[PDB]
Design a protein around this ligand. Structure first.
Ligand SMILES: [Cl-]
Ligand SMILES: [Cl-]
Ligand SMILES: [Mg+2]
Ligand SMILES: [Mg+2]
Ligand SMILES: [Mg+2]
Ligand SMILES: [Mg+2]
Lengths: 125, 212, 195, 4, 222, 204, 222, 196, 233, 195, 4, 4, 196, 4
């Protein structure tokens, strides 16, 4: 297997590959979340250098993970599909074994854990 | 073995005998067939002594890790399903277990799950499990009401194990009793059949089949 | 076959016996009387291997009736039970043994006592306050250990029996299609028609 | 091994 | 079991241990495996306990009737023939393994009989689970021209090998000496090298220890 | 499928000073199911006592058989059969069924009424006699009885002491066997009085 | 077909007093009807005031004891020389046994020592790791002969207070080490009388807060 | 077992080892497998000890009764009586028997009766487990009309080899000589025959 | 899962005051066929240990190779290989016992019964047994196969307990061993007359005697045995 | 387990499934729901080997629900049935196969048709007007061959089902403790509460 | 049945 | 059983 | 099969019958059971035809590779390679093999490898079903340091007898002679050897 | 299968 340690420490104690991943987020379209007294709202900018788009079929930016939880993002779009799939699978697996849908905190902790794993595993960015 | 657990007005009663046998050889009369998993969770043992003991104390460790990770006590449903999913992985290998997972949570109320080594998992109000289950059922069913007082419920559970201990050659020793409420489980003592039978015969006037 | 029970109370013996006759995945009959009158104060219920049961019961009945005619006298329940036991005890070492279990309920008129005998196909005889054959005993013995009293009336006995049938209908895997109940007392043998 |  | 037979000068001697087993359990610590077929013909038996007793009594009975009918003292070869033909008829199902010995008008004789009905002749023989331990001793110490006392020692030594080294044999040594012109002498418990040591404690209970429900006088009379 | 342990039960016998004791439990079951609590395994023919363990149908049959044989014996001989003689009759009768036996473990106990000697014996199912000074054991808890007897027993016990010893051997053996127990009876037998005591024991 | 198990016989026995515990076992080792050795110890000092015997199939017994001794060694290495309490040993042994649930050690295991309050403790295990603390346990071939004797003499079962009408039980009480060694010695001589696989010698390991002492006694060699 | 019978100038000789086996245990190391059924008709026994003894006893009885009524039976007649027993009871018998006898008309004769109860008249015969190892040797070394001393040597050398290779054979070599001169028993011990 | 083909019968042995004796015949049987006659079943390891083996000969030859490789391996980077770090009998045994039990645990045994006889460096006698099941035991006398049934009772007449060992000389013990070998030749249908014997003495070291023979046999009484019961001539 | 039936009428699929759970000589439960909702318009009933049944059903349910979330769309009954069949067809050659038989009842919203699929543990799939697994079919298929019409209403379907349950309660050896009935139509899945 |  |  | 190998003055000779059996049917009456694994190391094969061929092919391959790297292998080495195969695969193999070769140092050598994969170095060796019948003969007639002609006769006479009694042996007698002079193949037909 |  391809093994290279791509996420490593620099002399100042920074992990440049993680920090450069943040730069990719910075370049992404804006996303905002605001929670009311009794609701949560997810707003997302869509960059408007694109007409002739087909909005029926173009991947929407807010994704249902389960029927009670949604996830939105900024950054690399292809990367976000991988996290959403993993999150969706975990949501179903949690229901299967715990007989209860995920808490929002639990599902967040899972996605976060996946992201962390990719910062200290060989061969992956 | 004879073990039972039933739901009622005042929570859950759990009662078990204490005999272990190897064929007709009585190996022990002092087995603890109830395992105290946490202050709100009980597991009963029937089948292979080692299988039950090992995997039910293993279950306790898994429930402990749940509450460390999730900052919350595990649901009876989830605890029972850990055990049942475990034994299902071993299906065909020859594990022998008939267990009941008994407990209270705020989200569930008082709850009993029957879990066995074929991988059967059932929620229910009344179960009896073991070689003496039918004897226990006979007494239990014919006196059971949802509205039994805590006092009556405790006695019925105790009396049902006694019935089975008497008729079933592979049940005996002593009765162990538990009551489970919204505040957790409460132990209601170890009762040797040696003295309990004669006490019940006298006070209740039952067991006339027996030379008094 | 399957379910046969018996309870002896103060002044009578009550026999309850299931009505179903099942072969394969079909209940062929739901009104089968699994009993033979041996003499006017002796009744025998039976369960076991198909064919063997009735053949055995009728054979005993024929022998007891012959004795009655010969001596112009009714054999005591104890005597009939001993005769039956010996027949089964011979049978168990035959080329093909009778696979039949029986309950013999009788009122002994010399003693003025009801008597219940439980005999299995090996010829194992025991006199009991209450009895059962097959899987039935696994529910009823414990139940009866609890609720039975030696001095019960015939009516108390029937209520006690209702408890047994109720439990069996709750926990038994099979549909045995209810029971036919019969009472043996000082006035002979009669059948309860609504159970 | 024993059973219960 | 361990059993042996040894010939000497003027007769023959047989010996046996005294243990009976029912699986690993010792059923009887002091049973008699030496049987009298007739006054001067004795039998040692191994195998199924009831079979050796029953087959030995049956042939002993018929030998008595035969002795009366013929007005003669019974011969060992008659016991041998009757035993072997009976055992053969039963195809091994009668589990009797016997060393037959005795004196008669013809002389002194020593034979063995296996359950399927074959017989052997010899100056020294052993049968039973302990037969190899015993035979090791016999093959080591037997000689031509033994005196009566040498033969007894050799026989009981062979039984002792069985007692100590075979788990199927234990307790005591029985002997029987059949010398020509003399009465057979049956030496029950000739050796007793396995006396139980004094127990550490008396387990005699305080009277009234046992809980009683009922008493009654039993009528044994008429 | 092992006929000697379908019904369960035990019998033990002991000698004392000018007395014998013989005891049995009262259980009759069908494998795990206890059926009767009143099934006695000791019978007597005059002053000779016979205990029988094993398959209950054969226990009953053999009792009926030995009653028959001893009744005819008495009529022809004009005296009660003695234990030494009865022991021989038991042996003959069992071995007669050598290749289709009764699945039983009988035990004989009594006092010879001429010689005054206490006498006990035990048999296997095919008639082998085990005569003993001390004790004979039989049934599904025979291992336990052997253990209890071999440690508890001492020679020359007085009838009321012998009673305690045999009772404790029976009770504690029965409690380690799933198929024995449910009550017990002890016969104390002296040259011409016989006391019968029912023991209180655990009913599980 | 190759059978990976055998049966080496012998029997073991553990009794616990107030401030001591004993673990005894005979020293005979057998296969079938042969004696392999008259002195082959099977009760072991395992360190940390724990004695252990694993009786049945000797090869499995030795493997297990070896593994537990080794377990004690690493417990010291990994947890700063901490003493392995008897309750912790018991649980560790459960995992050793159950780890082979599908190809078991054919042994009945007993360990003895002192609990954390200095009281005597005996733990016993079935072959696949079910375990339980007791005052009292016999294991191995003669277990069925000895155990009911111990119920009667150690826990006073079926024994009542004379003249209390079988209403007041004999009251429970700890035994002196002198009393316990008497029950052990009598248990084994009785077992030797009636079981063919038990005999030759008896070795007792006594465990107090001052360590492990041994005592040895001759047993009948038949 | 190892057994054989050989015809020669003056009659016939029977030979056998002396080992009885009960597993791998030697139950008897000095067995006599050469058995008389009439003055000058003998047999060698192999297979089951019980079967062959029971058979020989019956045959001896038949020939004693034959003698009483019709005089001395022929060797062929004796072999016929063995056959009748072995053939008719072939399901229940494990008996390999060689029959050998001396007439004054017929001189020496050998009949072998293997497991199925067939009969085979031969110049010489070998049988028993140990015989397999000496088919080669015996076929190469047997001639007709050998002298007594040559025949004793042939049997001694043959059984020596059978005993050497067969674990189920051993002890002493017994022989029985059958001529007009009567009946002679020979015995040869290991220290002699082993180093041949 | 195996079945033994070419096999060796009993190995017998005992302790005496100064050492240990061990013996075994030179036969390799093939069922009832006494197939091979020059088979050495005692294998010396160093000058302080003899390993006697019964059972399957192909597995014995495998074990020979293990032992000869063990000697080689022990010499590696070991300047005290012929002194303080020489192989002891207890080392050689434990190694074999370890292998035997592992092979039984893999359901593929070495079909043998083994006796390791020797003298430890402190002068102590070593005698221990191990077989295909990995069962091990020590006794003043040890034997395998028929030897266990026939030799042990004879050898235990000489050394019946620990205390009898100081009282037993090498002449006495060799006599017992040699006599035991004769008995086995009388009674074991898979024994041979030829055998090897080895003494390991704490003073004289290892004496290995080849080509011994069973002698002084009693066969004469055979002539007096006629028939099987009633026959006279 | 034991009794599972299904009938497809004009505008719905009706599934009836027995409530008893029996192990040995004890009915452990009399209110067992032998069914899982796979999607809002698809229902699956199941019967077979203890443990295997629920494990399989829940595993399929988890997979179908995952698909629904991923595509924000409901798979057609035909598609779900094919997925289920493939899973069983793989399983039958595994080291330990799922011993589970299923009925899949669904309302296809694109077609506006109800659909009933019968699939056994080997992965044998068939679309049917009415279906059953186990011994139940031996009584119901012939009965339904007689009384069933393709254009029946949901109410007519339930009466037809009453006939099936009645026959099974008359002739079946076992007490299966009644059935839970569920209707799958254009408005989803609902349960009849008094049967 | 006891053996000897 | 004895063989020859 | 009947096979054997015999050492003598100048080297070693291998011999074998030519019968392959497939039941009681003779599948091949002219089989060559003598097989080359190196110029002057050969083997006789008995047991399974498939097993012994597969084994010999592997051994030939090992020794060819041995030769390339380290020169001519000893006969002992060749026997060791056979053993390794037979021993390690004893559960799946039915192969009774005799290995025979000629060194110039060691002269003639014979190693026999029976079913279990044990190794036995001998002056001569016999094996195969037919060998049972000639243990007697061969033990009586073999001497060391025979001449070539004596050794050919010994093998011819021995296998003649094995073939005569064993139904699983027959056809021609093949032999392979191994000396310093090279390698010689001999064949003898029934009409010659039968009437010996 | 072919044998030799
Ligand atoms: Cl013979
Ligand atoms: Cl080929
Ligand atoms: Mg009980
Ligand atoms: Mg009990
Ligand atoms: Mg003993
Ligand atoms: Mg030989």
């Amino acid at each position: 297997g391809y093994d290279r340690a791509l996420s490593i420490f620099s002399p100042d104690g920074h992990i440049f590959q993680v920090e450069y991943a943040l730069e990719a987020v910075k370049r992404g379209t804006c996303a905002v979340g605001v929670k009311g007294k009794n609701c949560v709202v997810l707003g997302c900018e869509r960059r408007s250098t694109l007409k002739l788009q087909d909005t029926r079929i173009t991947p929407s930016k807010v994704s249902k993970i389960d029927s009670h939880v949604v996830l939105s993002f900024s950054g690399l779009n292809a990367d976000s599909r991988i996290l959403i799939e993993k999150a969706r699978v975990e949501a179903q697996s949690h229901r299967l074994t715990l007989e209860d849908p995920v808490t929002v905190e639990y599902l967040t902790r899972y996605v976060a854990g996946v992201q962390q794993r990719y910062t200290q595993s060989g061969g992956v960015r | 073995t004879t073990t039972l657990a039933f739901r009622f007005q005042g929570g859950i009663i759990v009662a078990v005998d204490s005999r272990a046998t190897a064929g007709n050889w009585v190996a022990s009369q002092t087995v603890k067939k109830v395992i105290e998993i946490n202050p709100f969770l009980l597991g009963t043992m029937a089948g292979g002594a080692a299988d039950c003991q090992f995997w039910e104390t293993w279950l306790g460790s898994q429930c402990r890790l749940h509450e460390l990770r999730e900052k919350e006590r595990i649901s009876v449903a989830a605890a029972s399903k850990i055990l049942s999913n475990l034994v299902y992985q071993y299906k065909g290998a020859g594990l022998s277990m008939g267990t009941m997972i008994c407990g209270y949570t705020r989200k569930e109320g008082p709850t009993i799950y029957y879990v066995d080594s074929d991988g059967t998992r059932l929620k229910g109000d009344i179960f009896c499990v073991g070689s003496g289950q039918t004897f226990a059922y006979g007494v239990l069913d014919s006196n059971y009401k949802w509205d039994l007082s805590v006092e009556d419920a405790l006695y019925l559970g105790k009396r049902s194990i006694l019935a089975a201990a008497h008729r079933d050659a592979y049940s005996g020793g002593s009765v162990n009793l538990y009551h489970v409420t919204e505040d957790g489980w409460i132990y209601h003592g170890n009762h040797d059949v040696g003295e309990l039978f004669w006490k019940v015969k006298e006070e209740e006037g039952s067991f006339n089949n027996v030379i008094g | 076959m399957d379910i046969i029970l018996g309870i002896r109370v103060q002044d009578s013996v009550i026999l309850a016996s299931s009505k179903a006759v099942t072969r394969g995945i079909s209940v062929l009959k739901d009104s089968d009387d699994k009993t033979r009158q041996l003499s006017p104060h002796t009744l025998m219920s039976f369960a076991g291997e198909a064919g063997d049961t009735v053949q055995f019961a009728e054979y005993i009945q024929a022998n007891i009736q012959l004795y009655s005619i010969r001596e112009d006298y009714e054999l005591s329940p104890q005597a009939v039970s001993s005769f039956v036991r010996q027949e089964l005890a011979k049978s168990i070492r035959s080329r093909r043994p009778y696979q039949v279990n029986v309950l013999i309920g009788g009122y002994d008129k010399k003693k003025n006592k009801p008597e219940l005998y439980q005999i299995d196909y090996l010829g194992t005889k025991v006199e009991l306050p209450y009895g059962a054959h097959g899987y039935s005993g696994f529910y009823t013995f414990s139940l009866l250990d609890h609720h039975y009293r030696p001095d019960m009336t015939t009516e108390e006995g029937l209520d006690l029996l209702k408890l047994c049938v109720q439990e069996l209908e709750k926990r038994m895997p099979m549909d045995f299609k209810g029971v036919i109940v019969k009472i043996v007392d000082k006035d002979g043998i009669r059948q309860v028609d609504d159970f | 091994a024993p059973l219960x | 079991t361990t059993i042996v037979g040894v010939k000497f000068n003027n007769g023959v001697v047989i010996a046996a241990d005294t243990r009976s087993t029912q699986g690993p359990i010792v059923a009887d610590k002091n049973c008699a495996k030496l049987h009298r077929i007739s006054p001067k013909i004795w039998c040692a038996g191994a195998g199924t306990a009831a079979d050796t007793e029953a087959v030995t009594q049956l042939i002993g009975s018929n030998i008595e009737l035969h002795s009366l009918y013929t007005s003669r003292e019974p011969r060992v070869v008659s016991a041998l023939q009757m035993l072997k033909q009976h055992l053969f008829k039963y195809q091994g199902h009668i589990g009797a393994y016997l060393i037959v010995a005795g004196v008669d008008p013809t002389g002194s004789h020593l034979f063995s009989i296996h359950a399927h009905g074959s017989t052997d002749v010899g100056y020294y023989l052993s049968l039973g689970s302990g037969s190899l331990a015993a035979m090791a001793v016999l093959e080591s110490h037997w000689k031509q021209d033994l005196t009566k006392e040498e033969a007894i020692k050799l026989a009981s030594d062979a039984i002792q090998a069985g007692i100590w080294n075979d788990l199927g044999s234990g307790s005591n040594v029985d002997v029987c000496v059949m010398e020509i012109g003399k009465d057979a002498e049956y030496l029950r418990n000739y050796l007793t090298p396995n006396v139980r040591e004094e127990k550490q404690k008396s387990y005699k209970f305080p009277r009234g220890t046992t809980a009683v429900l009922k008493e009654s006088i039993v009528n044994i009379c008429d | 499928s092992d006929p000697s342990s379908i019904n369960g039960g035990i019998v033990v016998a002991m000698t004392g000073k000018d007395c014998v004791a013989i005891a049995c439990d009262l259980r009759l079951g069908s494998q795990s199911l206890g059926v009767s609590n009143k099934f006695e395994k000791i019978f007597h023919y005059g002053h000779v006592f016979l205990g029988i363990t094993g398959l209950a149908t054969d226990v009953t049959t053999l009792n009926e058989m030995f009653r028959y044989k001893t009744n005819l014996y008495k009529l022809k001989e004009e005296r009660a059969i003695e234990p030494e003689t009865f022991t021989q009759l038991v042996s003959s009768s069992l071995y007669e069924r050598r290749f289709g036996p009764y699945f039983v473990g009988p035990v004989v106990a009594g006092i010879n009424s001429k010689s005054g000697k206490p006498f006990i014996a035990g048999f296997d199912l095919i008639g082998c006699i085990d005569e003993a000074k001390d004790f004979i054991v039989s049934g599904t808890a025979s291992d336990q009885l052997f253990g209890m007897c071999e440690s508890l027993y001492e020679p020359n016990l007085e009838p009321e002491d012998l009673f305690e010893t045999i009772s404790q051997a029976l009770l504690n053996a029965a409690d380690r066997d799933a198929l024995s127990g449910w009550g017990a009876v002890v016969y104390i037998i002296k040259k011409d009085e016989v006391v019968k005591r029912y023991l209180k024991m655990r009913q599980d | 077909q190759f059978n990976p198990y055998g049966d080496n016989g012998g029997t073991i026995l553990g009794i616990a007093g107030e401030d001591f515990a004993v673990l005894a076992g005979d020293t005979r080792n057998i296969t079938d009807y042969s004696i392999n050795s008259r002195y082959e110890p099977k009760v072991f000092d395992c360190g940390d005031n724990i004695v252990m015997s694993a009786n049945g199939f000797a090869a499995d017994g030795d493997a297990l004891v070896k593994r537990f001794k080794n377990s004690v060694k690493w417990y010291h290495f990994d947890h700063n020389d901490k003493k392995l309490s008897i309750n912790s040993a018991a649980r560790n042994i459960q995992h050793l046994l159950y780890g082979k649930r599908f190809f078991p050690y054919y042994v009945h295991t007993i360990i003895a020592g002192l609990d954390e309050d200095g009281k005597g403790a005996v733990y016993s295990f079935d072959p696949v790791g079910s375990y339980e603390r007791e005052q009292c346990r016999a294991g191995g071939a003669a277990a069925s002969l000895i155990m009911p004797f111990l119920d009667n003499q150690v826990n006073f079962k079926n024994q009542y207070e004379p003249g209390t009408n079988g209403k007041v039980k004999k009251p429970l009480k700890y035994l002196s080490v002198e009393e316990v060694i008497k029950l052990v010695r009598d248990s084994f001589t009785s077992a030797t009388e009636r079981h063919i696989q038990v005999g030759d010698g008896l070795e007792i390991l006594i465990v107090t807060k001052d360590g492990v002492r041994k005592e040895f006694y001759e047993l009948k060699r038949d | 077992t190892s057994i054989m019978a050989v015809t020669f100038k003056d009659g016939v000789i029977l030979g056998a080892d002396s080992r009885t086996t009960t597993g791998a245990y030697i139950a008897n190391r000095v067995t006599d497998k050469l058995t008389r059924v009439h003055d000058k008709i003998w047999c060698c026994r192999s297979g089951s000890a019980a079967d062959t003894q029971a058979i020989a006893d019956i045959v001896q009885y038949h020939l004693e009764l034959y003698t009483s009524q019709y005089g001395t039976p022929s060797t062929e007649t004796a072999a016929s009586v063995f056959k009748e027993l072995c053939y008719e009871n072939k399901d229940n018998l494990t008996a390999g028997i060689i029959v050998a006898g001396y007439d004054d008309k017929n001189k020496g004769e050998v009949y072998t009766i293997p497991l199925g109860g067939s009969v085979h008249k031969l110049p010489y015969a070998i049988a028993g487990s140990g015989s397999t190892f000496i088919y080669g040797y015996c076929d190469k070394n047997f001639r007709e009309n050998m002298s007594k001393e040559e025949t004793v040597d042939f049997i001694k050398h043959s059984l020596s080899q059978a005993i050497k290779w067969d674990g189920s054979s051993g002890g002493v070599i017994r022989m029985v000589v059958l001529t007009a001169a009567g009946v002679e028993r020979l015995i040869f011990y290991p220290d002699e025959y082993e180093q041949l | 899962t195996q079945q033994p083909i070419v096999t060796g019968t009993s190995v017998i042995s005992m302790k005496y005051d100064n050492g240990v004796i061990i013996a075994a015949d030179n036969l390799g049987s093939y069922g009832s066929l006494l197939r091979f006659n020059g088979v050495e079943r005692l294998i010396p390891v160093g000058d302080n240990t003899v390993v006697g083996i019964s059972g399957d000969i192909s597995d014995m030859q495998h074990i020979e190779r293990l032992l000869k490789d063990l000697v080689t391996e022990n010499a590696y980077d070991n300047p005290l290989a012929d002194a303080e770090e020489a192989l002891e009998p207890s080392y050689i045994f434990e190694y074999l016992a370890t292998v035997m039990y592992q092979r039984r645990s893999k359901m593929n045994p070495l079909w043998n019964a083994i006796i390791v006889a020797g003298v430890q460096s402190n002068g102590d006698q070593f005698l221990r047994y191990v077989n295909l099941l990995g069962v091990t035991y020590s006794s003043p006398t040890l034997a395998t196969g028929f030897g266990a049934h026939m030799a042990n009772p004879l050898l235990r007449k000489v050394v019946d307990r620990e205390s009898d060992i100081p009282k037993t000389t090498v002449q006495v013990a060799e006599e017992a061993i040699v006599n035991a070998m004769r008995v086995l030749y009388y009674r074991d249908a898979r024994s041979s007359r030829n055998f090897s014997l080895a003494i390991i003495d704490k003073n004289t070291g290892l004496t290995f005697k080849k080509n011994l023979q069973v002698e002084n046999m009693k066969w004469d009484f055979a002539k007096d045995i006629k028939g099987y019961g009633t026959q006279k001539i």
